[PDB]
Every structure is written in C-alpha cells, then in structure tokens.
Amino acid sequence: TRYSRLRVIAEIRNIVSSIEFDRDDELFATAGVSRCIKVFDFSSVVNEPQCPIVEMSTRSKLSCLSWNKHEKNHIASSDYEGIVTVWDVTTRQSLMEYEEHEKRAWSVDFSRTEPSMLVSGSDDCKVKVWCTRQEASVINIDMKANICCVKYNPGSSNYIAVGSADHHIHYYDLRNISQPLHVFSGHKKAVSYVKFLSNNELASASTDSTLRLWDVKDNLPVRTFRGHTNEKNFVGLTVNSEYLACGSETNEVYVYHKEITRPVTSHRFGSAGSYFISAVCWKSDSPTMLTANSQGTIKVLVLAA
Amino acid sequence: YLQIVPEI
C-alpha cells in the first residue's frame, strides 16, 4: 500500500503511438499517426501552465521511438511503410533511412550496451539488426508470423526478446540465430510489447488482456497480471525495477507491482468516447510516468500514497 | 486501421 493512486502533475492537451525519455530523462519525444516527432523539455512541461522544442515531419505514420543511449541527440523511429529512421533532434535531419522491411515496422529499439546497434520488427515477419555505421542490415531473422515488438536485453547486446502474432515470445541470442534460446508460451493472443525489468526479468503484454512476467535466465513463467482491458489495440507497456504499467481500452492507466497479480492503482484519463491509452513510459526507476492516449493528450503522472 | 495489433 506504499502507493494507492496516480497524481496528475501536468497535462498537454490523433493517436500517440510512442512516448519516450532521452538518455538523461531530460527531454521526451512523442510520435504517432499525425506523422510528426515532437520533442519536449520535461522540466518545462512540469513547471509551466506548452510547446515542443523540436518537431520533425515524417513521410509515414509512426509506430515506435527509441532514443540512443549514448548519443544524447539521436532517436530512432519505425513507420507504417516499414522504414526505420535514425534522426538528430538538433539538426532535424535523418541520419540513416533503413528501407529493407517490405511492410509496416511496429517496433525499434536501440541497445543500451552497444549503442550503435538497433533492432526492428515488422509485419513482413522479419527481425532486422542494424548498425548506425552501416547502410545494410547486419542480421536478418526470418520468422513465421508478424513481429509486433522487439527489445534488447539491458545488460547485453547479444539478446533480444521478440513478441509475435503467433502468441509467443522468441528470445534470441544474436550470436546464433538458427534457433532461439527459448520460446515462451502462455499468452493466448498476439504479444504486443516486451520490456525488461532487469537482466533476467522480462515482461510482456498481449491482446489477451494480460501482462506476463518471465525469467530469461532459467526460462520460466513467473506471474500473470490482470485487471485492464486490452483485446484490440497497442495500449502501451512500460516497466522498471519494481513496477509494470500499461494502458487499457477503457481509457485508464493501470499500475502493477511485479509481485502482485492485480493492480496497485489505476487512473481514468478522462478528456463521450471510446478512447484508449496508447503509450506509457516510466521516468527510470522513479514513481513518475509519461502517458498519452488516442486523442493525443499527454499526461505526466506520479504514483503517490 | 490505426494502432491495431495484428491477429493471425
């Protein structure tokens, strides 16, 4: 009962598909169906009664963002055409445009430990690994079903989690892609997000209205979390050392502690409409979180007693 | 369709 609620500490008044903090939790960026990446200063948003400091127009609708963990000013995007772009938010220019995917790319992630490396996944059923110093993909994994999410392990660039429309999480060692290390079954519908709490703890979300926790050292199921409604949309998943947060098709943000299967708290986003939460992001291991919904509203929330 | 998870 350390926390019982989420307090709204700021609000910026369509769909925001991604909201992410930079390397220092100083700036954050949003992107979505409006074909624009917007960058905001977190402290200005919290202190003021609102305007992005940078906006970059894109050719296609955006599905995902990932900031570089070493180069402060670099951010990757994935788009509905399949293009994976690395941008510099100071110059506004695209640095790399990776165009090998043949269909919509749903996810991109920059590695924390080898920061020139990034991974993407697509409706074309491929996972591609890229290096910012090379135009062609470094690794290609041909899979059997649409890839909805990819994420690097936070401790090593050799491991990625891949969430698939086949309902499973495929956990790969990129040093030998002939077979995954392990494939985690349990979800009853597509796996829409994968996020690591730590080197050995992986969380997932699915359109079976569950989150699940997995042990990637010993290849074990750990826990299933329930309470929210997620049968259709990408509603967002974010985790830290202790907590999982996700969206819902009821326009509510849910928070779970990793040891407890039902929610610690929830927040009705408000504005009538069938809105859905569409993106969430913790501010590292703190109780502060960014959230956004299908109307494009952004809120800064904080877990509170 | 916008931000709808694929269902095969």
Residue numbers in the entry:
A (entry chain A): 351 to 363, 372 to 407, 411 to 632, 642 to 675
B (entry chain B): 57 to 64
Question: What does the study report here?
Answer:
We mapped putative VP motifs in all these proteins and assessed their binding affinities to the COP1 WD40 domain. We could detect binding for most of the peptide motifs in ITC assays, with dissociation constants in the mid‐micromolar range. Next, we obtained crystal structures for the different peptides bound to COP1 (1.3–2.0 Å resolution, see Tables EV1 and EV2, and EV4) to compare their peptide binding modes. We found that all peptides bind in a similar configuration with the VP forming the center of the binding site (r.m.s.d. between the different peptides range from ~ 0.3 to 1.5 Å, comparing 5 or 6 corresponding Cα atoms). In yeast 3‐hybrid assays, we find that, similar to HY5, UV‐B‐activated UVR8 can efficiently compete with HYH and an N‐terminal fragment of HFR1 for binding to COP1.
The COP1 E3 ubiquitin ligase is a central signaling hub that integrates inputs from plant light‐sensing photoreceptors. COP1 regulates gene expression and plays a central role as a repressor of photomorphogenesis by directly modulating the stability of transcription factors that control the expression of light‐regulated genes.
